[PDB]
Design a protein around this ligand. Structure first.
Ligand SMILES: O=C1[C@H](Cc2ccc(O)cc2)N2C(=O)CCN(C(=O)NCc3ccccc3)[C@H]2CN1Cc1cccc2ccccc12
Ligand SMILES: O=C1[C@H](Cc2ccc(O)cc2)N2C(=O)CCN(C(=O)NCc3ccccc3)[C@H]2CN1Cc1cccc2ccccc12
Ligand SMILES: O=C1[C@H](Cc2ccc(O)cc2)N2C(=O)CCN(C(=O)NCc3ccccc3)[C@H]2CN1Cc1cccc2ccccc12
Ligand SMILES: O=C1[C@H](Cc2ccc(O)cc2)N2C(=O)CCN(C(=O)NCc3ccccc3)[C@H]2CN1Cc1cccc2ccccc12
Ligand SMILES: O=C1[C@H](Cc2ccc(O)cc2)N2C(=O)CCN(C(=O)NCc3ccccc3)[C@H]2CN1Cc1cccc2ccccc12
Ligand SMILES: O=C1[C@H](Cc2ccc(O)cc2)N2C(=O)CCN(C(=O)NCc3ccccc3)[C@H]2CN1Cc1cccc2ccccc12
Ligand SMILES: O=C1[C@H](Cc2ccc(O)cc2)N2C(=O)CCN(C(=O)NCc3ccccc3)[C@H]2CN1Cc1cccc2ccccc12
Ligand SMILES: O=C1[C@H](Cc2ccc(O)cc2)N2C(=O)CCN(C(=O)NCc3ccccc3)[C@H]2CN1Cc1cccc2ccccc12
Lengths: 178, 183, 183, 184, 186, 179, 179, 184, 180
């Protein structure tokens, strides 16, 4: 990573890079960067670059809730791929300031998890992941304008969208053309 | 495994006298063998009792149901005798013996609990797995209610966690009919 | 982890503004760091609030109690804010924040359950281990009863298995004081 | 590895079983218990009156597997003599003490060891409590039977099994775990 | 990461605590940990031979000889070493808790203190096993003698009470004489 | 293993038992069974125990030892290749006057090996047990060889390799079987 | 392994023993049992020991060596493929005038291999033992070949590969069996 | 993990400024290279002032230990040795190598002496070379320990045949140290 | 590794001391070559001190060090502390004539080179020829540096040969034992 390291130099210009799988460590870093940028200037836009295969739903919600909490608009820009919780965060950007570059890929699908143990433990785990899916679908319905029923059907299996299809779907506002 | 002299391994010699030994974890291989032995003994004599010895920590519920349904299907009464331990699907099979012919030896342990499983993948796959294991538990509890005389509500409460019973407690519960006391 | 130049890593820059990030499993290393940060912040300013951000699946009960006791020891109020998830010892620390200054963001998850452990060895060693984890559970439940206003009997029932709460449910329960709603 | 004797062809252990000798010569697990239980039931069916000889050279093993053997011994009509050769430890020493009264033996250099049961528990506090209560009840059951078989008090057996307790054959006789040392 | 504080000098958080005469024993005790703690004690004595030192203990214990390197350094130096148990002090960790300056051994209210006999092992010839057994029994006698001196309990009572794992609350550790005070929050 | 009976079963028909491996419970159970079987076939005729063994379990070895002393037939012992540790103990356990080695056979004597792990009091129990086991081995070897317990203790402190002729001088065997 | 008897059992009926593997205690126990069985069947008729072996355990090899010298029948040795290390020692141990190799068989001689770990005094005991073992091997090989102990010591310092004709010249065999 | 002191030194570098060298690990070539470098540096800074070598070590490499030993004897400053925790094997050899009258142990420190350990694999003549080398190494160690302690080589040979654990007071009686540093 | 106000090894290098205290591999040789070239550039006349505590290692890495020592203008003193074995003892013998030392309890070991080869007969032949030529090269240079004949070096290195510091001096591998 060249030398500020290159990411620290971008952060000085209010650019945050989400460029990996989303886990608690990545979420903690991005939340810290968002809070720091709000403290530096509560009015100026923040730019969140997304190239992510997704990851932890709770880690993703740490990022999502921090975006909605802070005063500055957070622009989202998909470069490469936004999949799963990565496409959820792309859709979470400020209304009118969600972008993808023309060859970027967006993928939506239902959450993944696991359950092991007694029948009643499996029931608790199943109910939890089903409630988590309902929560994701409700918010994605609000952010995209698509019905909960449509989001449920469209996320049953891996669903790959082009940048233009993601715009038609309401996950982004514009394809950033060169 | 010793041989007895025709030349039989000890288990084959017991099978000649209509004794079946369920002495391991229950998996498809064990169930296939026990089902085959039950069908063979019914063919050899459709009226004479069969004796099923149970020392098992349990295992596969579907493998256990292969044994359970074969017991109920065949004409001979199948006596069940718990020696050592009958746990989980093992205690279910103990309770499945012919009414009045379910036994435990005095220091045998019986344990009842809810079924165990696991699921990994998409939310909808986890939901299918959960619904399946919950329906399997309802099926087990309904049959155990019928075989013990306890309510489904009581069986559900009593199997929430591992529940260890003495032979005498298993008799009081209705899982067996008698403790076989030594002369 | 980026650097900010005024050179701080981003977490050190937050600590300058009295924000401590509990963003991983709780083990002795994490507890030693957070205890040291709390003692340092008290020394820097005994009056100004501290902000403990919690995104944690929990972890060691003794490590969690190192953090808990240090929070209660120091003079400044420690606000707690759940973002993402607070589970097990993480939800215990969330409930341990200054009265009126325990928060969750709207989509944060809170989970409560009984302590986990293990024991291997002689019967008497297993008895010692069991007695210790049962006493630990009684201590946790008594403190959660004090911090939530729920009865010990209700906390015992509600932590028997994994119990997932929304931010609004955690507020109704008394684990937090407010859901921090966005403008 | 195991030799054959021809009189019909028997492996050496099958030849001993023809003379009502059963070899408990390994760790006790469910497979070993199933075999020994089967041998005991077979020998009772062959002759309900004649003694059976159970040779014990075992480090012990599963308590429930051991109780499968113990209860089958007590159930059947023939007396089961027990003979410790080499070592009888843990559930092996329990089975040694379970032989017909007056017919429990050890050879002079055989080792007998008694100790409390071993196990494990993992999971939630309530699951650990269930496991602890179960192993403590199992220990009480073992100690009660050993008290009956030896003539020692339950309290003495509890103290004497707190840690590994090694006995010579003569000490095992003094304790009441065997009736006689078989001198050459 | 371990955070940095700037006061201008830049310190990792543990180095900042050391500047205020606080030493963190926050891991299993091995020779590396003991070398670090002994070095810190010698450094703090050289900086000020009169001012108290604060030894924080959150440790499951570890090496008895490494623990005795710390113990003897505490007794050797002129400053009082306060001990404070936070989280847990088990095995040689609880021994070091009891080793603090008389009247300045503390625990926070929910800290766990565990005492038990030393653990070890030996494999090889009968005479090698005999040497190993004699060594660990002599080590236990030495630990028990010092704990008797530090607590006021008899050696016979310490032997009985350490036969198996013995978990004490902070208040029980005070009653036992392993600490002087529970630091109750204001 | 060739057939004639497998070769070992054919030797057992002629009252020859082969102890040709490490001594563990399985080997001891087999040899004890063979000794009891041979006594039942003929209580008067000698048995021949061939020993080529590096030793092994002391309790397994004592299962064999006590069965030899219990039965009525004399058990001749013949060391071929090596008798080490509990193997040399069993060589010395043969009928007096009928313990042999072939000329190039190796005999090794040493103290018992073991291990101990856990609490100080558990290590003390393990140490006391292995020391008592060594006292028992040395007492019996003193009786079988005519050497003092003090001499056996000194001579087994470390691995002590003996030729067949040295084993005869020591009293572990009666004769070297010369061609 | 085909049946005719398995093929090896059929050869044993004609007094042929196959040493066709590494020499360990199991192989030695089997070969010793076969030698004793053949002596019992007929004390006068020759035995034929086929050797294709990379060698192995010296003590296991001495179990075979001493049994060969003990029994009454002559044991012919025939090297086919390879006789190395303790395998070449057993080839040289056959009845005088009845040690053979086939023309392309390889014979290798070298000093014994081993190991020692532990205290200096334990390493000293292990070193003394393997040096005494080498002296014993070299003394017997000197007797069986007619070469001096000094020459055998020099010639076994490193791996020394011999053709069948060189093994004859050396005195390890009596004849190359020409087709 | 290792704290910093700012006047910026890690804690060990700060002690080295006051002529203290901390040996708290197994002795290997890396540890020996560092301690040799520290001794040479301290001699260059001041050839007259004492150096203080703290030892808490289970020992390790004999040749690495001799790198330290010979450097101690070579340099002009006296090297005081102080055993804290344990000095075993080559660690106890280095403790005994300190300046005469300036070898110390704290009261609960342990000293252990024993013969050197090693291994050999291969041909008989390779095993002979390895055996002769470790026996000569033991003779070298025992001769120097005889000179440093005042005990005979015969006594050191007997006393190191197996692991021999000494208290601080016993190490003083033996001549491995000069004084037990008792607390004020 | 402590700091002085430099890490301890960097502080020694300031006084023209190079520490060869590990197995010799390409990384170690690259560092020591770089240090020798740097010290020559700082002062072409002042001695350099090479401390050797090494079990040896790569022959080609050892020759990188050997040739750099002979190339540069400053005398390179060699001092054996602890042990110099195999390529380590070769480098000890490579120091400036009259400036090769060992401390009294240092161990010196000489032996033939080690290697291996797997594959076709002709590949094994190439590997064997290469290691035999490497041995001839080492023995020729050791003959030049010690004054012993190639025949004596060949015999004396057939197996591991351990020398005391005094024996290493008698052999010609060092000039003096540095007595305290
Ligand atoms: O709840 C607080 C309030 C929020 C706030 C911020 C600014 C205001 O004007 C009013 C309320 N809070 C503070 O009251 C002070 C400390 N803090 C800051 O945000 N401080 C500014 C800061 C400067 C440099 C780096 C990071 C933050 C914050 C810290 N926190 C907790 C907190 C901690 C960590 C992450 C958070 C993400 C979203 C919301 C709250 C977070
Ligand atoms: O459905 C049949 C019928 C059942 C039957 C049995 C007895 C009767 O009187 C009438 C119907 N069936 C056959 O009709 C003929 C073959 N068969 C037997 O049970 N045959 C006798 C037999 C002899 C020896 C060994 C085992 C079985 C059986 C085989 N099967 C299929 C079958 C196959 C395998 C296991 C089964 C377990 C329970 C029920 C049927 C099983
Ligand atoms: O018990 C003491 C007292 C507590 C104290 C603090 C402030 C007071 O006004 C009165 C008592 N103690 C001291 O008496 C002095 C050293 N110390 C400090 O807290 N020093 C201030 C400091 C400066 C820079 C970083 C961290 C702490 C503390 C250090 N400690 C031990 C201690 C050590 C480590 C963690 C602790 C957590 C909670 C309570 C005590 C801890
Ligand atoms: O409960 C019975 C009765 C017991 C019995 C035995 C003899 C009697 O005179 C009366 C009752 N039972 C039977 O009624 C008949 C089949 N059986 C036998 O023991 N059969 C004789 C047999 C012949 C050949 C080998 C083994 C046993 C037995 C089989 N069983 C179940 C049984 C099955 C397996 C192990 C057992 C161990 C202890 C007690 C019962 C066991
Ligand atoms: O104690 C008995 C007595 C001993 C006995 C033998 C012969 C006598 O004339 C008197 C006592 N015992 C029996 O009383 C009868 C069963 N048994 C035999 O040895 N039976 C003869 C036999 C025939 C075929 C194979 C093996 C043994 C034996 C079996 N046992 C137990 C026993 C079991 C297994 C191994 C033993 C080794 C030594 C001593 C006793 C052993
Ligand atoms: O010492 C004996 C004597 C030797 C003997 C053989 C023949 C004689 O005419 C005289 C002495 N011995 C016996 O006295 C009788 C049992 N035995 C035999 O060799 N029996 C004949 C036999 C028949 C079938 C298979 C194998 C051997 C042998 C068994 N042995 C012990 C023995 C056991 C095993 C291997 C041996 C190898 C070499 C020498 C003795 C061995
Ligand atoms: O042989 C010399 C001489 C020894 C010497 C030292 C002081 C004197 O007054 C006379 C001779 N030698 C030098 O002649 C100069 C370089 N050197 C030094 O010791 N230099 C001082 C120094 C300054 C800063 C860090 C370390 C050393 C040393 C370096 N060396 C080689 C050497 C190198 C490495 C470790 C050694 C350990 C013991 C003895 C010699 C060692
Ligand atoms: O061949 C040269 C010449 C050699 C030279 C040195 C001094 C002279 O007066 C003349 C020729 N050479 C240069 O011509 C210039 C670059 N160089 C240096 O040695 N530069 C000095 C230097 C300064 C700081 C660090 C290291 C070296 C060197 C670099 N090199 C190539 C080189 C590169 C790397 C290692 C070498 C080891 C031995 C010989 C040459 C090596």
């Amino acid at each position: 990573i060249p030398t500020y390291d290159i990411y620290s130099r971008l952060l000085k210009d209010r650019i945050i890079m989400l460029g990996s799988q989303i886990d608690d460590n990545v979420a903690n870093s991005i939340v810290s960067q968002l809070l720091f940028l709000q403290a530096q200037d509560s009015e100026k836009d923040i730019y969140l670059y997304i190239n992510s295969p997704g990851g932890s739903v709770t880690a993703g919600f740490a990022i999502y809730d921090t975006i909605q909490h802070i005063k500055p608009d957070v622009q989202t820009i998909c470069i490469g791929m936004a999949a799963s919780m990565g496409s959820f965060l792309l859709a979470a950007g400020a209304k009118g300031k969600r972008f993808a570059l023309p060859n970027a890929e967006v993928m939506i699908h239902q959450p993944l998890g696991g359950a092991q143990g007694q029948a009643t433990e499996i029931e608790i785990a199943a109910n939890h992941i089903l409630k988590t899916r309902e929560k994701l679908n409700r918010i994605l319905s609000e952010r995209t304008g698509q019905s909960i029923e449509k989001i449920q059907k469209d996320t049953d299996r891996d669903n790959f969208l082009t940048a233009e299809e993601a715009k038609e779907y309401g996950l982004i506002d514009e394809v950033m053309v060169p």
